[PDB]
Amino acid sequence: GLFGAIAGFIEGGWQGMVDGWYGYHHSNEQGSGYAADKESTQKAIDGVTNKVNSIIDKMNTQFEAVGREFNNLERRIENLNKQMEDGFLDVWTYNAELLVLMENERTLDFHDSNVKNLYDKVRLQLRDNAKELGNGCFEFYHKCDNECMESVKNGTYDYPQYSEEARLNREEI
Amino acid sequence: GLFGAIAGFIEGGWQGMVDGWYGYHHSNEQGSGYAADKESTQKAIDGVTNKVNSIIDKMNTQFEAVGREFNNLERRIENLNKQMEDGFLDVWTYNAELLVLMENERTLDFHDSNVKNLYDKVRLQLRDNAKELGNGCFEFYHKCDNECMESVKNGTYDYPQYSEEARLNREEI
Amino acid sequence: GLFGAIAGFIEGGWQGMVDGWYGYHHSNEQGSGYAADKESTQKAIDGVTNKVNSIIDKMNTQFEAVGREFNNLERRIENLNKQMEDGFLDVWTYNAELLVLMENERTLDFHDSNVKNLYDKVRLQLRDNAKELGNGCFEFYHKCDNECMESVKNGTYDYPQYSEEARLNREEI
Amino acid sequence: PGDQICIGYHANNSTEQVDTIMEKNVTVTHAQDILEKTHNGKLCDLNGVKPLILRDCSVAGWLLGNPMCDEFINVPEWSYIVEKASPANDLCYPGDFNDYEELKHLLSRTNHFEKIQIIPKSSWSNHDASSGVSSACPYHGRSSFFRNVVWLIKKNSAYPTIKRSYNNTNQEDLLVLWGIHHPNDAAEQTKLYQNPTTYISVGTSTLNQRLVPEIATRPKVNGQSGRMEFFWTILKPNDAINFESNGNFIAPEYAYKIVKKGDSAIMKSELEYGNCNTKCQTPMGAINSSMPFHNIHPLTIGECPKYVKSNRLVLATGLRNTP
Amino acid sequence: PGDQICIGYHANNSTEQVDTIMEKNVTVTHAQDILEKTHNGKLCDLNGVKPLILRDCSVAGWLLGNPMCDEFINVPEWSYIVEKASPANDLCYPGDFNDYEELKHLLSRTNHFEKIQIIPKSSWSNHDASSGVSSACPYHGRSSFFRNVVWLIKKNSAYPTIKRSYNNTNQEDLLVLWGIHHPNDAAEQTKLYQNPTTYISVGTSTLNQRLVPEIATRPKVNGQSGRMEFFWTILKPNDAINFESNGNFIAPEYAYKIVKKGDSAIMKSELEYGNCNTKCQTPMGAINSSMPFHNIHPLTIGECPKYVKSNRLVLATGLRNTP
Amino acid sequence: PGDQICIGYHANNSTEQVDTIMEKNVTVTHAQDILEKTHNGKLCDLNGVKPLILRDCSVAGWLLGNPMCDEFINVPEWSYIVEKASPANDLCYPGDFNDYEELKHLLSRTNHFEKIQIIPKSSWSNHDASSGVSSACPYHGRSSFFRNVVWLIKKNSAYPTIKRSYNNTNQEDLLVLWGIHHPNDAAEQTKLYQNPTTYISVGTSTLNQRLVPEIATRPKVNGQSGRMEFFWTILKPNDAINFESNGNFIAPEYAYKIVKKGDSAIMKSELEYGNCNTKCQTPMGAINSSMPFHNIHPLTIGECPKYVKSNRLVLATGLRNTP
């Protein structure tokens, strides 16, 4: 998509992850597992929910067709009346169909962007303490236990804590 | 543009490249040359073509003005009728003109995105086996024949295959 | 936002930079200070100004209600006339409200994109001659005097000039 | 072999598809349909106020009191009105209804008619108010006529000039109906109303008209070759209506008090009551929906989704699903 | 320890908020309001051309010349026209103004009337042009009548047939008004115009009518139970209008030259003049704005912002502000 | 020292520019124009079926049969109708066409009129069907008249009551025209039709009218100071039309079978036939285009692009081109 993440450098989604839209899969000695990023999923939920409501809201001042009768010598204005009703019905149909097509494209891109942002959040924390495999994963230049993983997930990664053992493993390769 | 690639870190297009929208310029011992990335180019062709067709489809239920005549004591309804016809013409003109502006912009950013993503596709493959010049070019830390180049283009670059040839060229310098 | 910069990896704006929207804060031996990137700022100003002017322009052919009178036996066309007027008033109110909502969203993301591009502009120049702190700041691996700071800011950084002293400083680390 | 963490996104067995400008049929993890496409195919009460279904009577047939329309002699407050495309019981005696569409319109702005006797049929002492009956308006096989309007005919070979007046003392507007008869030839004119050349004049604070019968020979419609032209007015609460005629007068007996003015409609539909209740009604059926859009029919009444001509409106809420 | 450079973005003490699809109340560094929401609550002159304010007069009252409307005997060029919702001074003698709405429409496409005497009141030698007066149309407490139009009455128990003709020699279209009187009874008919059956025929290149007074008894409106029905036509520059009547004729004396046709309007408003000037006027007040939008009132005249039903239209121009 | 690979994008010598919200005149590699701005400037067939071009005749002149409109005595099936703005051959004898516009509307929903003789001119045994002729309707230097309708005038100083009837035996609707004459004065009245006071009565299952001539003195138009007023109705496939009149009747001779009802139009244009063919026609000329939009003229007929008021509509398809 627009942001290269969803169906991009991260090829495919995870059936295993079910409690959120975006998140992590870790893999250490203590074991592996899927886990949802609460912050980014919720933020997205708020955005799309606000979007659906904003779309529903902007359409309440829409046109409402009313029955009007005309006789055999009122054909011109009957026709004018039909053209007007059809006219507005066609305008609001365009307005809804198009608005739906457009926000659908952006909804998709919003998710793509949300994934690329989550990936970068982790990337910018880890720096040289890990290697970018290029498929959405970071292979650590050190051992990252479950609590360290938890540190990455909640944005409190202590780069200098692992800086030295990371450097040592960098230079041996 | 929005994605920093077209007219961004890749300053300028290639007159020399003529068989596609996005692609590669290689330069090794075997010789240099332009080549178009067919898949990502075709993908855009599919996207822009659907876009043009979808705009045209959304405008098929547009308003169509009809001749109606009125006499000298029907001036109010004459005027009502002209106001209505002009009303829809103005609405539908706005609708087309704005949609064209909006989609034109998105189409340009789409291309910007397609290029930036293609750049990343290569970058994420090559990693530390090549150096980012910062202008859309990658300088290799090893020897890359025509066979190597074809592997990068089709997403089949084997990182560890050259990791060692590349590693040697990194540290002596 | 969409591009991860504003309120993203750069967590916060600077009250201190006042001569523009986007820019730099440098810090060397000669001293520190804020400065706006005139180029990217002017581009954004031009873009937003054209946007505002385009929105106001697209609305000149909008519907204009006209006073029309009818008698007790013209209730039908009176009502038709009212529905027509409200009809267009509701359409154009939607068009103005929606256009503002949509372009507001794009504007915020536009700024986000200009910032992320500015960061990338510097990053792609500095390469391994500086360290990505991951907060919008690059820590230099060499001495960057005021004139050097100015070269980064105007896109004339001479990477190889500092390449050697940078490389040496990287390797004692 | 090193420790690693992966960034990724949700996926499921969902098949829901969505459209965008560049791509069609995009399988997605979560979607919201915003288009209602179903109705119960029934005409229902609207928020606890029953609708007026005219069956085979038309508004004319109802209001004038076509003998086949007895069902509607005393209708209660209504939400809306349902009339068929071509009701069978319209003007039983052939003729015209003046400003009919404006009257149907005024109706659509009305919730309650209370029928009132304005000049009793018995009170025509010096004219014949009893042979004013026709085979074109059969009641139960027996010849009859419109029930709220009386066909005055000559008595004892005399049609004295009529001078009747009614002052609206009620607090509500009053709808008054009357008519004129257009005979076939000068012969029939004298046969029915003595005077050969006649007029009907009506006077109100706002109204002033003088109608003269237009004789012609016409094809027979419902057996009759004559024509009756009906007229109406609204009599303001302290106004009075003055009738003066020397023949061809079809006089009012019953008029209509406008008890409740409100927002209503005349729905064209061929279906009938369903004994249900709703907040949203359509000529094809009722809507129970929370969708913001529907595509059943443009002409609706009540709290309704916005009508739209689409076959499909679905918003992506989730993200692009993987195969 | 080391030299560094930072990329960052502007922030300030702004509290201005802006809305988007996904988010509401987004504090932003710079925003532009594009909706004008204020007016001066006054009716004003439009680009140095004063409007015609009818005060308590109606257009009919003005044009026919209701004696209570003397302010407008000779009004200057106007920009727009202001009329109250329900003006008191309309038709002082009760009746109707045919195609009145179509006449107001013609006005709204007009800026300047020059009144001209088309048939001098003095030229009525064999009819009474002095007794055509009523207490329904009081002047200074004394019974009077519309000023531009003459209620001709029998003289010496005779109402000779009238044949007056007027050829428009001007270069402009000319608006001519006339009328017919509808009496209460055959008696009143006789008392005013001797002759029992009367007509009024008017002839033009395009116009052809013959009116016959419709005698009836109607409720009293302003004491009067008769009615007057007024008519108008536009007499093209080399055309002529032909009146022929033997009674009930309400004759034109003054007609109106359409001097300036332009774009104008009849604004329904209850307010009066303010001695100010404006470039954009609405029935609630005038607008002094550079905003591209306003929400004051839909019906405006002059160079105006585009009306919209919003309470708020504010564009983000700056970027998301940090707290 | 090293091998390198570069990522880049297309560029060319294109000058095609395109607009967006934020930037105008953005040069691009590839664009698609979607606005048609050209036509052949002539009137053409619509899918091989010739339009009815009235040249200098009006619709009235055609249907009534103004002698100068003989070109159209028998018109074949048409796609659309073209009428000039101010056709010279309209009503040769001055007057009006009642509900003219409603008739033109019915025309635009029609493709084929087949003229049929409904009342033979020869069949008027007791009236003069030959002197009903005017200098206002000149043919070959001699006075004549509308050809589809007959000006019956008194014979041997007597005008017997007319009682003619026509029953539609065709399977089509048929359009019937008739008229009434408004003389200048009572002398002329007696001169042409013996009786001093007359009427024209028409009867149909749905129609009932009785027209009475309104005499007035009018300026001379095309030499005549009298007026003729024309009327019409549609006679349903099994209905009959009944005329009864004692004077001033302009009787039908020819009526029109409505053979093909379809979708058509009456175009106001000043140009004439071009012997070309198209799928889309405009008042300024015809359109052969695959473009989805055009800015030629709003009033079009056939499968057309959608009209839009733009001078320019161009989609970017390629990418931003580099200088």
Ligand SMILES: *[C@@H]1O[C@H](CO)[C@@H](O[C@@H]2O[C@H](CO)[C@@H](O)[C@H](O)[C@H]2NC(C)=O)[C@H](O)[C@H]1NC(C)=O
């Ligand atoms: C209809 O009847 C009412 C009720 O009597 C009339 O109004 C009354 O008129 C008399 C004399 O003018 C007054 O003494 C009463 O006080 C009036 N009643 C009211 C309502 O105040 C009314 O004039 C009649 N309407 C017509 C058109 O004759």
Ligand SMILES: *[C@@H]1O[C@H](CO)[C@@H](O[C@@H]2O[C@H](CO)[C@@H](O)[C@H](O)[C@H]2NC(C)=O)[C@H](O)[C@H]1NC(C)=O
């Ligand atoms: C966009 O290009 C055109 C020139 O081709 C300019 O369009 C306007 O219209 C005509 C077209 O030739 C010019 O001669 C005018 O000078 C133009 N007026 C405007 C809008 O300035 C236009 O100038 C170009 N766009 C801009 C912003 O410079």
Ligand SMILES: *[C@@H]1O[C@H](CO)[C@@H](O[C@@H]2O[C@H](CO)[C@@H](O)[C@H](O)[C@H]2NC(C)=O)[C@H](O)[C@H]1NC(C)=O
């Ligand atoms: C109204 O008056 C004008 C002015 O006299 C008439 O126009 C004249 O028509 C005659 C033909 O009879 C010409 O010879 C003159 O040149 C015209 N005069 C001018 C100055 O235009 C006009 O015909 C009259 N209209 C009617 C029908 O009464």
Ligand SMILES: *[C@@H]1O[C@H](CO)[C@@H](O)[C@H](O)[C@H]1NC(C)=O
């Ligand atoms: C979209 O999918 C549906 C079937 O699920 C079908 O109606 C349609 O053909 C598809 N669209 C395209 C472009 O084929």
Ligand SMILES: *[C@@H]1O[C@H](CO)[C@@H](O)[C@H](O)[C@H]1NC(C)=O
């Ligand atoms: C017209 O003639 C036809 C055929 O003879 C007949 O069926 C029909 O009743 C006639 N119409 C009328 C009402 O005169």
Ligand SMILES: *[C@@H]1O[C@H](CO)[C@@H](O)[C@H](O)[C@H]1NC(C)=O
């Ligand atoms: C926006 O802020 C205003 C207070 O100034 C208030 O009207 C509204 O609640 C806010 N919008 C929402 C619902 O967040």
Ligand SMILES: *[C@@H]1O[C@H](CO)[C@@H](O)[C@H](O)[C@H]1NC(C)=O
């Ligand atoms: C459309 O135009 C072309 C020439 O430009 C010509 O073939 C003809 O006029 C039209 N085409 C068809 C369908 O014959």
